[PDB]
Structures are given as C-alpha cells and as structure tokens.
Design an enzyme around this catalytic site. Structure first.
Site, PDB file in Angstrom:
ATOM      1  N   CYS A  10       6.553   9.196   2.582  1.00  0.00           N
ATOM      2  CA  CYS A  10       6.523   9.104   4.056  1.00  0.00           C
ATOM      3  C   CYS A  10       5.409   8.147   4.475  1.00  0.00           C
ATOM      4  O   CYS A  10       4.658   7.672   3.644  1.00  0.00           O
ATOM      5  CB  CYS A  10       6.422  10.479   4.756  1.00  0.00           C
ATOM      6  SG  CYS A  10       4.804  11.305   4.836  1.00  0.00           S
ATOM      7  N   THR A  11       5.317   7.882   5.768  1.00  0.00           N
ATOM      8  CA  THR A  11       4.411   6.867   6.325  1.00  0.00           C
ATOM      9  C   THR A  11       2.954   6.940   5.856  1.00  0.00           C
ATOM     10  O   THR A  11       2.362   5.921   5.484  1.00  0.00           O
ATOM     11  CB  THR A  11       4.458   6.940   7.869  1.00  0.00           C
ATOM     12  OG1 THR A  11       5.819   6.829   8.304  1.00  0.00           O
ATOM     13  CG2 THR A  11       3.630   5.841   8.509  1.00  0.00           C
ATOM     14  N   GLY A  12       2.380   8.135   5.880  1.00  0.00           N
ATOM     15  CA  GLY A  12       0.962   8.294   5.537  1.00  0.00           C
ATOM     16  C   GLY A  12       0.693   9.269   4.401  1.00  0.00           C
ATOM     17  O   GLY A  12      -0.439   9.713   4.195  1.00  0.00           O
ATOM     18  N   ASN A  13       1.745   9.599   3.654  1.00  0.00           N
ATOM     19  CA  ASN A  13       1.701  10.686   2.670  1.00  0.00           C
ATOM     20  C   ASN A  13       0.891  11.856   3.225  1.00  0.00           C
ATOM     21  O   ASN A  13      -0.076  12.304   2.615  1.00  0.00           O
ATOM     22  CB  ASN A  13       1.087  10.209   1.344  1.00  0.00           C
ATOM     23  CG  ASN A  13       1.279  11.218   0.209  1.00  0.00           C
ATOM     24  OD1 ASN A  13       0.544  11.187  -0.780  1.00  0.00           O
ATOM     25  ND2 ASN A  13       2.291  12.083   0.321  1.00  0.00           N
ATOM     26  N   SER A  14       1.335  12.343   4.384  1.00  0.00           N
ATOM     27  CA  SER A  14       0.535  13.223   5.226  1.00  0.00           C
ATOM     28  C   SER A  14       1.221  14.536   5.567  1.00  0.00           C
ATOM     29  O   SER A  14       0.610  15.606   5.523  1.00  0.00           O
ATOM     30  CB  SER A  14       0.247  12.479   6.531  1.00  0.00           C
ATOM     31  OG  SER A  14       1.431  11.884   7.044  1.00  0.00           O
ATOM     32  N   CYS A  15       2.485  14.411   5.958  1.00  0.00           N
ATOM     33  CA  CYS A  15       3.175  15.502   6.595  1.00  0.00           C
ATOM     34  C   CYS A  15       4.511  15.801   5.922  1.00  0.00           C
ATOM     35  O   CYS A  15       4.569  16.711   5.096  1.00  0.00           O
ATOM     36  CB  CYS A  15       3.302  15.214   8.086  1.00  0.00           C
ATOM     37  SG  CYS A  15       4.037  16.516   8.998  1.00  0.00           S
ATOM     38  N   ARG A  16       5.557  15.040   6.239  1.00  0.00           N
ATOM     39  CA  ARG A  16       6.867  15.280   5.640  1.00  0.00           C
ATOM     40  C   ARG A  16       6.850  15.231   4.106  1.00  0.00           C
ATOM     41  O   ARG A  16       7.392  16.122   3.452  1.00  0.00           O
ATOM     42  CB  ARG A  16       7.896  14.307   6.203  1.00  0.00           C
ATOM     43  CG  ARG A  16       8.262  14.656   7.655  1.00  0.00           C
ATOM     44  CD  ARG A  16       8.957  13.505   8.341  1.00  0.00           C
ATOM     45  NE  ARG A  16       8.004  12.506   8.792  1.00  0.00           N
ATOM     46  CZ  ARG A  16       8.301  11.516   9.630  1.00  0.00           C
ATOM     47  NH1 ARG A  16       9.543  11.399  10.120  1.00  0.00           N
ATOM     48  NH2 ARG A  16       7.352  10.661  10.004  1.00  0.00           N
ATOM     49  N   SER A  17       6.228  14.200   3.534  1.00  0.00           N
ATOM     50  CA  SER A  17       6.159  14.087   2.070  1.00  0.00           C
ATOM     51  C   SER A  17       5.265  15.139   1.418  1.00  0.00           C
ATOM     52  O   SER A  17       5.531  15.532   0.285  1.00  0.00           O
ATOM     53  CB  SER A  17       5.744  12.677   1.638  1.00  0.00           C
ATOM     54  OG  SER A  17       4.458  12.362   2.128  1.00  0.00           O
ATOM     55  N   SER A  36       4.247  12.524  -4.576  1.00  0.00           N
ATOM     56  CA  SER A  36       4.444  12.023  -3.213  1.00  0.00           C
ATOM     57  C   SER A  36       3.465  10.901  -2.935  1.00  0.00           C
ATOM     58  O   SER A  36       2.371  10.859  -3.514  1.00  0.00           O
ATOM     59  CB  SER A  36       4.268  13.155  -2.188  1.00  0.00           C
ATOM     60  OG  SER A  36       2.911  13.552  -2.083  1.00  0.00           O
ATOM     61  N   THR A  63      -2.907  15.574  -3.002  1.00  0.00           N
ATOM     62  CA  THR A  63      -3.509  14.271  -2.751  1.00  0.00           C
ATOM     63  C   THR A  63      -2.642  13.407  -1.825  1.00  0.00           C
ATOM     64  O   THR A  63      -1.401  13.450  -1.900  1.00  0.00           O
ATOM     65  CB  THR A  63      -3.801  13.520  -4.096  1.00  0.00           C
ATOM     66  OG1 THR A  63      -2.626  13.486  -4.910  1.00  0.00           O
ATOM     67  CG2 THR A  63      -4.877  14.260  -4.878  1.00  0.00           C
ATOM     68  N   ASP A  65      -1.716   9.705  -1.318  1.00  0.00           N
ATOM     69  CA  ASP A  65      -1.730   8.574  -2.254  1.00  0.00           C
ATOM     70  C   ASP A  65      -0.875   7.423  -1.785  1.00  0.00           C
ATOM     71  O   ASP A  65       0.120   7.624  -1.086  1.00  0.00           O
ATOM     72  CB  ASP A  65      -1.168   9.028  -3.597  1.00  0.00           C
ATOM     73  CG  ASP A  65      -1.870  10.244  -4.124  1.00  0.00           C
ATOM     74  OD1 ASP A  65      -3.089  10.143  -4.379  1.00  0.00           O
ATOM     75  OD2 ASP A  65      -1.226  11.301  -4.256  1.00  0.00           O
ATOM     76  N   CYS A  82      11.224   9.099   6.134  1.00  0.00           N
ATOM     77  CA  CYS A  82      11.097   8.596   7.498  1.00  0.00           C
ATOM     78  C   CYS A  82      11.476   7.131   7.521  1.00  0.00           C
ATOM     79  O   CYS A  82      11.554   6.502   6.472  1.00  0.00           O
ATOM     80  CB  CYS A  82       9.677   8.809   8.024  1.00  0.00           C
ATOM     81  SG  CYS A  82       8.393   7.909   7.129  1.00  0.00           S
ATOM     82  N   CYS A  89       9.668   0.460   2.096  1.00  0.00           N
ATOM     83  CA  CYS A  89       9.681   0.813   0.694  1.00  0.00           C
ATOM     84  C   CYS A  89       9.598  -0.482  -0.114  1.00  0.00           C
ATOM     85  O   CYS A  89      10.343  -1.424   0.172  1.00  0.00           O
ATOM     86  CB  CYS A  89      10.976   1.559   0.371  1.00  0.00           C
ATOM     87  SG  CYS A  89      11.026   2.234  -1.282  1.00  0.00           S
ATOM     88  N   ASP A 105       9.754  13.389  13.000  1.00  0.00           N
ATOM     89  CA  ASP A 105       8.315  13.345  12.893  1.00  0.00           C
ATOM     90  C   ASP A 105       7.716  14.396  13.828  1.00  0.00           C
ATOM     91  O   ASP A 105       7.868  14.304  15.052  1.00  0.00           O
ATOM     92  CB  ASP A 105       7.820  11.948  13.258  1.00  0.00           C
ATOM     93  CG  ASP A 105       6.346  11.756  12.979  1.00  0.00           C
ATOM     94  OD1 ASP A 105       5.671  12.701  12.506  1.00  0.00           O
ATOM     95  OD2 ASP A 105       5.858  10.640  13.238  1.00  0.00           O
TER      96      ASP A 105
HETATM   97 NA    NA Z   1       0.510  12.397  -2.984  1.00  0.00          NA
END
Ligand code: NA
Length: 131
Positions: A10-17, A36, A63, A65, A82, A89, A105
């Site tokens: 995902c965009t910021g490897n933050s939420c969905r991922s 992720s 993490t 990443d 997303c 990608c 999101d």
């Molecule tokens: Na990660």
C-alpha cells in the site's frame, strides 16, 4: 513443498498493507511467508493498530518498509491494496504474478472506517486461502 511468499503493498506500508500482513500471518501462516511494503514508509497507522487489537492481533511491532526487489523476485503473489500502490508498483519480475485487491482508504476518518476495511481485508484473505 516450501512455503509460498505473498507481498502486500500500500501507499505508506501503514494501514491496509499492515492489516493485511497481520491477518495474513494468522490465516495463511501454514502455507505462506507474509511480507508488506510501500511506495513510501509512514509507520504503522495508530488506528490500524487499534483495529487489529480488537481482533486479538498485535501489529504494533510490524515494520514499515519500502519495496524490496529480492522479495519481489521470490513472491508467488504480489497484492496491491490501493490505487497509488497499483499505479506506482515497480516493474515486476517477468514470472511474478500480481493482483490488485482494492480497498477503501480509511485515512483521516473515524475508527469505524478502519474496522470496516480491516474486516473486508480479513474476508479477502480467507477466500484467498481457499482458492
Ligand atoms: Na512491512
């Protein structure tokens, strides 16, 4: 058979991922290594952490990443979560399969939106296991 490798982006490897990794390790763990990454790294979203706590999964030490070409090369499935991740990608290895599983999101919204998306991700991973 060696375990397969699934890579959630995902965009910021933050939420969905991050929610996808947390669910994936639980649901897919017998058959899969789960990683992720993101286009950027935003850290693990606090409302995502809280959402996963509600379902007894700790993602607080996962993490955030950037995308790694070695993991790409060894992936059995790359999943973009997303539009940013899918549209940006990097070029994939020719023999590496990619699918886009789009989720909304929850960014900047009430916790309910994180719960909603958490559970859509849960169901997608459960169906995937049984393909
Ligand atoms: Na990660």
């Amino acid at each position: 058979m060696d375990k397969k490798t699934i890579y959630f982006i995902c965009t910021g490897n933050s939420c969905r991922s991050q929610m996808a990794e947390g669910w994936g390790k639980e649901i897919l763990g017998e058959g899969w290594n789960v990683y992720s990454a993101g286009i950027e790294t935003h850290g693990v979203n606090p409302k995502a952490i809280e959402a996963m706590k509600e379902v007894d999964i700790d993602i607080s030490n996962q993490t955030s990443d950037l995308i790694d070409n070695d993991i790409l090369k060894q992936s059995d499935l790359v999943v973009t979560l997303c539009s940013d991740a899918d549209n940006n990608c990097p070029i994939l290895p020719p023999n590496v399969k990619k699918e886009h599983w789009g989720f909304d999101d929850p960014a900047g919204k009430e916790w309910s939106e994180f719960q909603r998306v958490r559970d859509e991700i849960k169901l997608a991973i459960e169906k995937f296991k049984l393909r």
